[PDB]
Amino acid sequence: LQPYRQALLDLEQEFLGDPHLSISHVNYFLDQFQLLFPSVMVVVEQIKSQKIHGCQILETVYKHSCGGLPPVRSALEKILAVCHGVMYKQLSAWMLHGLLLDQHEEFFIKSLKQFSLRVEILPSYIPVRVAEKILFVGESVQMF
Amino acid sequence: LLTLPVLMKRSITAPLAAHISLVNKAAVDYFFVELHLEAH
């Protein structure tokens, strides 16, 4: 939303910085954002109806990041970088220090119990072929 | 915002436990000689 806020301050220096406008210029200037918002409005309406949770939001984000529209494919890319940030933090937490910091949640890892790979809530674009490797080094630190 | 959140808070304080382990090693002698405990 920083782009929208910027593109709404940039009119403030005209609606009383250029003494006449008509909303046809406003409608045009913000018609750029007439395209982006419903494309992310459907994302938060998907969240509010499907009761999405935990890492099972990264699939929703990465799904609609495959919508071909380049503006939309940048907006939901910049959301995706933040949330990968979080899951990276959880994975930096677990793997070197044996800490499943995943309170009230699933970071897809549910003595082997609370050390078991869930795969229902796992990203489609992350394979089990490497989640098995993750889980194994996680149990590894757990026994030293 | 921190790349080691809980992971290494304790690791700042943990050289205290080394001091403790030294004070502990320097606790045994009072009984081994200032008492001669096990010779007794």
Swiss-Prot record, chain A:
One of its GO terms (cellular component) is microtubule. It comes from the Eukaryota. One of its GO terms (biological process) is meiotic cell cycle. Keywords: Cytoplasm, Cytoskeleton, Intellectual disability, Microtubule, Primary microcephaly. Coiled coil: none annotated. It is found in: Cytoplasm, Cytoskeleton, Microtubule organizing center, Centrosome. Ubiquitously expressed. Component of the gamma-tubulin ring complex (gTuRC) which mediates microtubule nucleation. The gTuRC regulates the minus-end nucleation of alpha-beta tubulin heterodimers that grow into microtubule protafilaments, a critical step in centrosome duplication and spindle formation. It is linked to Microcephaly and chorioretinopathy, autosomal recessive, 3: A disorder characterized by congenital microcephaly and chorioretinal dysplasia associated with poor vision and nystagmus. Variable ocular anomalies include microphthalmia, retinal folding, retinal detachment, optic nerve hypoplasia, absence of retinal vessels, round areas of chorioretinal atrophy, and attenuated electroretinogram. Most patients have mild developmental delay and mild learning difficulties. This is Gamma-tubulin complex component 4. It comes from Homo sapiens. The chain holds residues 97 to 286 of 667 of the full protein.
From Swiss-Prot, chain B:
It comes from the Eukaryota. It is found in: Cytoplasm, Cytoskeleton, Microtubule organizing center, Centrosome. It is linked to Microcephaly and chorioretinopathy, autosomal recessive, 1: A syndrome characterized by microcephaly, cognitive impairment, underdeveloped retina and choroid, and epilepsy in some patients. The more anterior parts of the retina, near the periphery and pars plana, have a grayish hue and diminutive vasculature similar to retinopathy of prematurity. Visual impairment becomes evident during the first year of life. Component of the gamma-tubulin ring complex (gTuRC) which mediates microtubule nucleation. The gTuRC regulates the minus-end nucleation of alpha-beta tubulin heterodimers that grow into microtubule protafilaments, a critical step in centrosome duplication and spindle formation. Belongs to the TUBGCP family. Component of the gamma-tubulin ring complex (gTuRC) consisting of TUBGCP2, TUBGCP3, TUBGCP4, TUBGCP5 and TUBGCP6 and gamma-tubulin TUBG1 or TUBG2. TUBGCP2, TUBGCP3, TUBGCP4, TUBGCP5 and TUBGCP6 assemble in a 5:5:2:1:1 stoichiometry; each is associated with a gamma-tubulin, thereby arranging 14 gamma-tubulins in a helical manner. Gamma-tubulin at the first position is blocked by TUBGCP3 at the last position, allowing 13 protafilaments to grow into a microtubule. This is Gamma-tubulin complex component 6. It comes from Homo sapiens (Human). The lineage of its organism: Eukaryota, Metazoa, Chordata, Craniata, Vertebrata. The gene is TUBGCP6.
